[PDB]
A paper describes a structure:
Here, we use a panel of human monoclonal antibodies with neutralizing activity to long-chain α-neurotoxins (LNTxs) to investigate pH-dependent antigen binding. To establish the molecular basis for pH-dependent antigen binding in these antibodies, we determined at five different pHs the crystal structures of two neutralizing antibodies (A01 and D11) with different pH-dependent binding affinities to LNTxs from the elapids Naja kaouthia and Bungarus multicinctus. Collectively, these results provide a basis for the neutralization of LNTxs by the A01 and D11 mAbs by receptor mimicry, thereby inhibiting toxin interactions with the nAChR through the heavy-chain CDR-H3 loop.
To understand the molecular mechanism for pH-dependent antigen binding by A01, we determined the crystal structure of the A01 antibody in a complex with α-cobratoxin at different pHs. Accordingly, we determined the high-resolution structures of the A01 mAb produced as a single-chain variable fragment (scFv) in a complex with α-cobratoxin at pH 6.0, pH 5.5, and pH 4.5 at 1.49 Å, 1.60 Å, and 1.55 Å resolution, respectively. An SGGS hairpin in the CDR-H3 protrudes between finger I and finger II of α-cobratoxin and is stabilized by a disulfide bond between Cys100CDR-H3 and Cys100eCDR-H3, facilitating a hydrogen bond between the backbone of Gly100cCDR-H3 in the hairpin with Thr6 in finger I. The binding is further stabilized by the formation of a short β-sheet interaction between the backbone carbonyl and amide of Cys100eCDR-H3 and Val37. Further analysis reveals the presence of additional hydrogen bonds, cation–π interactions, and a charged hydrogen bond (salt bridge) with the side chains of residues Arg33 and Arg36 on finger II, which occupy the center of the paratope. The A01 light-chain stabilizes a cation-π interaction between the side chains of Tyr100iCDR-H3 and Arg70 on the C-terminal tail of α-cobratoxin. This interaction is facilitated by a hydrogen bond and salt-bridge interaction with the carboxyl group of Asp95aCDR-L3. Furthermore, there were no histidine residues in the binding interface between A01 and α-cobratoxin, indicating that pH-dependency is not coupled through the direct interactions of histidine residues in the paratope or epitope. While the interactions facilitated by Asp95aCDR-L3 and α-cobratoxin are equivalent at pH 6.0, pH 5.5, and pH 4.5, Asp95aCDR-L3 is present in the light chains of chain-shuffled mAbs A04 and G09. Our simulations indicate that the conserved histidine residue in the CDR-L1 loop of both mAbs (His34CDR-L1) has a higher probability of protonation at pH 5.5 in A01 (protonation probability: 0.59) than D11 (protonation probability: ∼0.00). Protonation of His34CDR-L1 in A01 was accompanied by a significantly increased water molecule network around the histidine imidazole group, which enables the paratope to adopt a greater number of conformational states that are unfavorable for antigen binding at pH 5.5 compared to pH 7.5 (c also).
Author numbering: 1 to 71
Write the structure that this text describes.
Amino acid sequence: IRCFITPDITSKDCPNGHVCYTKTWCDAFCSIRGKRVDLGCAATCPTVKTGVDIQCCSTDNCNPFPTRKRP
Ligand SMILES: [Cl-]
């Protein structure tokens, strides 16, 4: 599967991966710089601790980097 990967934010081939993932959470700068985003690929949808969100998908490049919409 092909997925976007942080910190390059480029699409990479994960020949042995099955899903892409988007992990987001707030650090101390979340108000001014938005959530931190970790994009990657995995054989299965990884697990995240409390306060961290993860959305997994199973098609090439289905985890585009989500920027914050600027009002
Ligand atoms: Cl985590």
